[PDB]
Design a binder for this molecule. Sequence first.
Ligand SMILES: [Br-]
Ligand SMILES: [Br-]
Ligand SMILES: [Br-]
Lengths: 211, 213
Amino acid sequence: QVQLQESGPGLVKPSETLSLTCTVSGGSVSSGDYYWTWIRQSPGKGLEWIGHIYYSGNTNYNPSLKSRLTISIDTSKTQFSLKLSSVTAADTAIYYCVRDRVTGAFDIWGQGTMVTVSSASTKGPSVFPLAPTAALGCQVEDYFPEPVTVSWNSGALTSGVHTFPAVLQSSGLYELSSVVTVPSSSLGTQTYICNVNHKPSNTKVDKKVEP
Amino acid sequence: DIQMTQSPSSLSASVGDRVTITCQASQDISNYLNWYQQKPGKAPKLLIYDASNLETGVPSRFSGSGSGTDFTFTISSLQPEDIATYFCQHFDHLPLAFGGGTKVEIKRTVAAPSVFIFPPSDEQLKSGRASVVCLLNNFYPREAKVQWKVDNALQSGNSQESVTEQDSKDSTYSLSSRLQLSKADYEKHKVYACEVTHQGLSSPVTKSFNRGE
Ligand SMILES: [Br-]
Ligand SMILES: [Br-]
Ligand SMILES: [Br-]
């Protein structure tokens, strides 16, 4: 079972170039049955097919992005890449690398990566406890850009966890909460740690929540 | 350059219902039509290819049909984990294009929320900000009204809300309302109240605290 995964900056400045790389792991990129494709998704233009590349070196690209598009392939590292030139805020989207059967079907997608086009620089989040069934959580704020991942006790605690969509602050940075409900008796024995990871700034914060 | 029109743009149906969404191509595309399902926070997943072929590893309740210009996606019996946005995709000719998407939410019985109010931690106050957070847990329907009262004074324009996607097990929503203030403004008052109006609450529910206590 093949898996695809994107890597690259979550934040790129205007007039700069967006460079994304897909790592095809578990399978060979030198297969004739598939087209190695990029697709993005944003609120202003929905799901949008960007283009693809065949293992023989041939591309196609979407005519709407014909000018600033460059899709390469690297059979040595089983990677294929994407380059988008002189980006604007309209290029802010979630970008996916996708396996497309030659018969025509996007049967394997990557998880996707969020790309924000902004002149501002990254900032790691501040994490503050939401202390006390009983409800507790973590306040994650003062970060940019999206996204942040929040896990509880390194993934051991997953039931009843709710991580809310971030909203904007007056500063223009993001802010969210991650909450989880627990039995009120566990507050004297069990410790609860929220694990906040912010890749665009390479910021990891573990925060202990106590009564 | 084909135009893919999906209908409706969103719908809600009860568990066990037969859901049917349509995709109309702006020209004949034979059976060059695929169906995708995008669960919350995930990438789209292939369900139907060639307008009617079920993908391996997909439940039998999903199916597709149609050819030429009109295509219908169908869920024979709607299940709790079937909540997602569904897209049609043509591969008649480049460029490949998706439809606008059909969001499928689930109608379930009413459920009142569990309400919790969180004062800002002393650690947040050291940064200079103060967010008073009110939590509404596991309710339905999605519609909820949260009013903030500071010393019995209604607040307006200084709070933000945030609601999770509908849960794939119990089909409920959870909501977060935060009163965004500065340390200076937050420490000028005592009573911070969160009042909730919801279809499952016969009378509104207020959760409050005194600053400090
Ligand atoms: Br997030
Ligand atoms: Br760092
Ligand atoms: Br084709």
